[PDB]
Design a protein around this motif. Structure first.
Motif, PDB file in Angstrom:
ATOM      1  N   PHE A   5       0.843  -1.221   0.000  1.00  0.00           N
ATOM      2  CA  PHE A   5       0.000   0.000   0.000  1.00  0.00           C
ATOM      3  C   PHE A   5       0.872   1.264   0.000  1.00  0.00           C
ATOM      4  CE2 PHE A   5      -2.853  -3.271   1.836  1.00  0.00           C
ATOM      5  CZ  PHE A   5      -3.970  -3.116   1.052  1.00  0.00           C
ATOM      6  N   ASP A   6       2.052   1.229   0.636  1.00  0.00           N
ATOM      7  CA  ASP A   6       3.017   2.370   0.720  1.00  0.00           C
ATOM      8  C   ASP A   6       3.510   2.763  -0.687  1.00  0.00           C
ATOM      9  OD1 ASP A   6       4.496   4.326   2.210  1.00  0.00           O
ATOM     10  OD2 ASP A   6       6.311   3.058   1.916  1.00  0.00           O
ATOM     11  N   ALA A   8       2.109   1.825  -3.588  1.00  0.00           N
ATOM     12  CA  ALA A   8       0.882   2.184  -4.336  1.00  0.00           C
ATOM     13  C   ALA A   8       0.556   3.648  -4.060  1.00  0.00           C
ATOM     14  CB  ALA A   8      -0.253   1.288  -3.951  1.00  0.00           C
ATOM     15  N   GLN A   9       0.568   4.036  -2.786  1.00  0.00           N
ATOM     16  CA  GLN A   9       0.268   5.426  -2.369  1.00  0.00           C
ATOM     17  C   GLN A   9       1.262   6.413  -3.000  1.00  0.00           C
ATOM     18  OE1 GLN A   9      -1.113   6.914   1.840  1.00  0.00           O
ATOM     19  NE2 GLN A   9       1.064   6.423   1.829  1.00  0.00           N
ATOM     20  N   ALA A  10       2.545   6.074  -2.988  1.00  0.00           N
ATOM     21  CA  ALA A  10       3.616   6.960  -3.510  1.00  0.00           C
ATOM     22  C   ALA A  10       3.388   7.198  -5.010  1.00  0.00           C
ATOM     23  CB  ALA A  10       4.970   6.355  -3.238  1.00  0.00           C
ATOM     24  N   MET A  12       0.263   6.923  -6.553  1.00  0.00           N
ATOM     25  CA  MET A  12      -0.989   7.707  -6.729  1.00  0.00           C
ATOM     26  C   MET A  12      -0.762   9.189  -6.429  1.00  0.00           C
ATOM     27  SD  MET A  12      -2.913   5.470  -7.889  1.00  0.00           S
ATOM     28  CE  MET A  12      -4.501   6.287  -7.989  1.00  0.00           C
ATOM     29  N   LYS A  13       0.022   9.522  -5.398  1.00  0.00           N
ATOM     30  CA  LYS A  13       0.148  10.927  -4.912  1.00  0.00           C
ATOM     31  C   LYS A  13       0.902  11.813  -5.922  1.00  0.00           C
ATOM     32  CE  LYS A  13      -0.358  10.192   0.119  1.00  0.00           C
ATOM     33  NZ  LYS A  13      -1.554  10.982   0.501  1.00  0.00           N
ATOM     34  N   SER A 104      -5.070   0.498  -7.371  1.00  0.00           N
ATOM     35  CA  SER A 104      -5.381   1.842  -6.806  1.00  0.00           C
ATOM     36  C   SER A 104      -6.118   2.717  -7.835  1.00  0.00           C
ATOM     37  CB  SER A 104      -4.142   2.520  -6.266  1.00  0.00           C
ATOM     38  OG  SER A 104      -3.060   2.445  -7.182  1.00  0.00           O
ATOM     39  N   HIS A 106      -8.309   6.593  -8.404  1.00  0.00           N
ATOM     40  CA  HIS A 106      -8.654   7.927  -7.874  1.00  0.00           C
ATOM     41  C   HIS A 106      -9.529   8.663  -8.888  1.00  0.00           C
ATOM     42  CE1 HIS A 106      -8.329  11.218  -4.990  1.00  0.00           C
ATOM     43  NE2 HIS A 106      -8.285  12.004  -6.097  1.00  0.00           N
ATOM     44  N   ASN A 112      -9.079   8.022  -3.418  1.00  0.00           N
ATOM     45  CA  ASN A 112      -8.147   7.354  -2.476  1.00  0.00           C
ATOM     46  C   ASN A 112      -8.563   5.900  -2.208  1.00  0.00           C
ATOM     47  OD1 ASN A 112      -6.484   9.722  -1.811  1.00  0.00           O
ATOM     48  ND2 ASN A 112      -8.475  10.518  -1.209  1.00  0.00           N
ATOM     49  N   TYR A 114      -7.882   1.866  -2.577  1.00  0.00           N
ATOM     50  CA  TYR A 114      -6.821   0.834  -2.703  1.00  0.00           C
ATOM     51  C   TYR A 114      -7.438  -0.548  -2.427  1.00  0.00           C
ATOM     52  CZ  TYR A 114      -3.781   4.977  -2.184  1.00  0.00           C
ATOM     53  OH  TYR A 114      -3.140   6.166  -2.387  1.00  0.00           O
TER      54      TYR A 114
END
Length: 182
Positions: A5-6, A8-10, A12-13, A104, A106, A112, A114
């Motif tokens: 998830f870390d 994936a988040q990096a 997406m952001k 992921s 958005h 947001n 996931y």
């Protein structure tokens, strides 16, 4: 929740925008410079909306393999005043299977979001909405409308974009490093 998830988040952001065509709202992965990908069924034209801003399309190419079979990836160059972070070094070089992937998304409808989709199979051939399609990845999650263009990652790799499902499984088109050599 964990190192999947870390990553994936990096991604997406910094490397996603909301793309809107006449066919709907899509998650759109930015890869490098002003170059992004979207499912071919988005039917990208001369003009697209990027985070609700009218944007000229400088180039759009619907990828096909060397047998002239649909890959369901369109590469778009955007007339945008800003470049994406270069993530081409996170792209696989060859077709493969994967463990422990995350999808992921958005959009306005699904901000947001996931989904831990688990094991990803190199499925290969799929009749996708009646169109013969190659280089399909399959995961066993009941993916729904609104998820197309969603990014498929493992830790350290961006492996595909979500292009469909059948109620029980989801399907992604492979991203390969060789699509984005310049």
């Amino acid at each position: 929740m964990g190192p999947g998830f870390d990553f994936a988040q990096a991604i997406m952001k910094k490397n996603t925008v909301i793309a809107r065509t006449e066919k709907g709202e899509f998650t759109m992965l930015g890869v490098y410079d002003r170059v992004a990908v979207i499912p071919t069924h988005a039917s990208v034209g001369e003009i697209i909306y990027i985070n609700d801003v009218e944007t000229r399309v400088l180039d759009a190419c619907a990828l096909r393999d060397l047998t002239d079979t649909n890959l369901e990836i369109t590469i778009v160059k955007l007339d945008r005043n800003q470049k994406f972070r270069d993530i081409r070094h996170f792209l696989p070089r060859c077709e493969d299977d994967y463990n422990d992937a995350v999808l992921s998304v958005h959009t306005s409808k699904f901000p947001n979001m996931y989904i831990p989709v688990g094991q990803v199979t190199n499925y290969g051939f799929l009749n996708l909405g009646g169109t013969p399609t190659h280089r399909i990845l399959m995961y066993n999650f009941p993916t729904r409308a609104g998820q197309c263009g969603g990014v498929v990652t493992t830790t350290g790799k961006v492996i595909g974009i979500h292009v469909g499902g059948n109620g029980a499984q989801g399907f992604a088109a492979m991203l390969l490093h060789s699509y984005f050599t310049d």
